[PDB]
């Protein structure tokens, strides 16, 4: 009997913002780790891990949005990143790109975790339009350099922020939303790998579909009353949130979590809905949760890859 150990890392100041929320709204079985070279919000992280990288180059502050000085203060820390990662068999790296320590840092930190095993999967944002090209240039080197790192990445442009607020919405909550990504993705394995499905999934599904697979995608849907199959799998397959939606997809692990109610018609209707948006012939790894305690609640999750 396996029990994955799953470490997040936030690398730079966005990345730690994300860890240091997603530790204030609860999340158990997952090892946190807080990797920034700006010792001033660094001592602010709630990590219970906290890497300080770079100290002898930026003599404590970040890296002024140079990322050859993030990049070369992660490799100087080499091995207290390791040590950090050590025993994690999946790493979830999350990092802004276009700054200086999440650019040139997140790629190394991702390096290292591959190169000792784990299953690595980055999430990282673009930056906004309104911060400039010079920014957005930068960035885009950063997710080049994650791609080559990563077993799987997910990409964020904060630009789609904009899409799902208002004119009054507060940044913070904005932010929340786009932390969501990365959350509700961890928690969708670690409540995958914890829970003994009637069609059982586990940790070797997910290398299986992530492993070496280049963009991903990570959902979660619930709904209830009648259509509930239909609509949760529509929704966790369509974030308006990613740069990577679902058309395409040649790996699909889709898992349904129902109470005793769960028809085999409505988890054929909600594998239809993934396989139909994908529009391709895919590895589809298809599993099933019966939970009695649920009444006519049903959860749909979705990690898609391959494209
Ligand atoms: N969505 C989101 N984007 C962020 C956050 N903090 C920073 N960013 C973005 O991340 C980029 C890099 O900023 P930051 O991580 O502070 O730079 P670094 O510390 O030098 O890596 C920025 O240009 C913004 O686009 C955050 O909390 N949420
Ligand atoms: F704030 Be980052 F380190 F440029
Ligand atoms: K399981």
Redesign the pocket.
Known sequence: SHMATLKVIG?????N??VNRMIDHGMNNVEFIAI?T?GQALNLSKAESKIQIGEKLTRGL??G?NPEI?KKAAEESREQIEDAIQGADMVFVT?????????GAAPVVAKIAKEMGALTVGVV????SF?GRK?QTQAAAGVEAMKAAVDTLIV?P?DR?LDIVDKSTPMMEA?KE?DNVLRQGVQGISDLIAVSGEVNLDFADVKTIMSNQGSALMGIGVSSGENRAVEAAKKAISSPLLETSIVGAQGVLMNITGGESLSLFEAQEAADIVQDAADEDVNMIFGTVINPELQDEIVVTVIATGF
């Open positions: 690398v730079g100041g966005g990345g913002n994300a920034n700006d970040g890296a949005a993030g990092s802004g790109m276009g700054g200086g320590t999440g650019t944002t673009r930056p906004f911060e920014r964020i904060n922020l932010f786009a």
